[PDB]
Amino acid sequence: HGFVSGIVADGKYYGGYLVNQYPYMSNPPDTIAWSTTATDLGFVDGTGYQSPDIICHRDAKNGKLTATVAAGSQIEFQWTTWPESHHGPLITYLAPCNGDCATVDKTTLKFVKIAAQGLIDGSNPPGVWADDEMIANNNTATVTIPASYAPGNYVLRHEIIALHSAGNLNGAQNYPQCFNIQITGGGSAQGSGTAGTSLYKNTDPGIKFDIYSDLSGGYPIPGPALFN
């Protein structure tokens, strides 16, 4: 359980969607981050992978602002202190808005995986994962926007999947957080994206996964193919 309280792009801090405050308001502050009703600091599990809830989290609605970021530069995601128990991958996607992301319909978004990290060291299960590296780095995740990516408005979908109960069907806990960005000084490339409700299925090999047994088979990161 946790959320992203803010991000850093082009060296500028942007406050996130404060999920333990903003839902409890008629007129929450404008943010680059999508609103959600995930007030338990909870998650979407396999029972929701084909629901629109998986796209930007429960009941998500468009953020009203957008952050600029240079192609080839790093975005930092400041998570609220993440439990060491909740081992799992960090995955980050871009979907083009083909206009202002403040008025994109989330169900139309086609996400391209631009970064993913999984199991770092599984010699002693449950081992060391991408979220453990995040924790050690001042509870901050980092993602490079590809220098080749075309300039435009995109929803940036950053996600932890906690696998501590993922041996059970619908046991994995997905924590997606969305942000509106405008990539500047870009290239000409863009991936072929996947609809949010097509990213994951509950029987995927990296979803229904036992972190506590021998990990000599590694960990296949779920979701569609990583953009090169």
Reading the block at residue 213, the tokens are 């047994």
134 membership: H or E segment, kind and range: helix 130-136
Contacted by 110, from Cu ion, Na ion, none: CB < 5 to 8 Å by type: none
Residue of 209, 207, 189, 221 whose CA lies nearest to 94: 189
Single residue of 45, 53, 131, 159 touching Na ion by CB under 5 A: 131
Cα distance between residue 55 and residue 177, in whole Å: 9
Residue linked to tokens 């770092």: 120
User: Phi and psi (nearest 5°) for 191?
Assistant: -85, 170
Should residue 164 be labelled a site residue for Cu ion when binding is judged by CB under 5 A? no
Does residue 45 interact with Na ion by CB under 5 A? Answer: no
Region of 71-79, 85-93, 105-113, 171-179 interacting with Na ion (CB under 5 A): 85-93
Among 1-9, 15-23, 57-65, 142-150, which window interacts with Cu ion (CB under 5 A)?
Answer: 1-9
Reference 130, options 119, 139, 138, 144; nearest CA is 119
The piece of 8-16, 79-87, 150-158, 174-182 that touches Na ion (CB under 5 A) is 79-87
Closest to Na ion by CB, 127 vs 152, is: 127
Half-sphere exposure of 172 (CA within 13 A, CB side): 28
Round to whole Å and give the CA distance between 178 and 61.
Answer: 10
Nearer to Na ion, 75 or 162 (CB): 162
**Ligand-binding site membership of 173 (annotated):** yes
Q: Kindly state the smallest distance separating residue 183's Cβ from Na ion, in Å.
A: 30
Q: 93 to 122, contacts with Na ion by CB under 5 A?
A: none
At 139, the amino acid letter reads N
Among 1, 120, 147, 184, which residue interacts with Cu ion (rule: CB under 5 A)? 1
Catalog residues that contact Na ion under the rule CB under 5 A.
84, 87, 131-132
Catalog residues that contact Cu ion under the rule CB under 5 A.
1
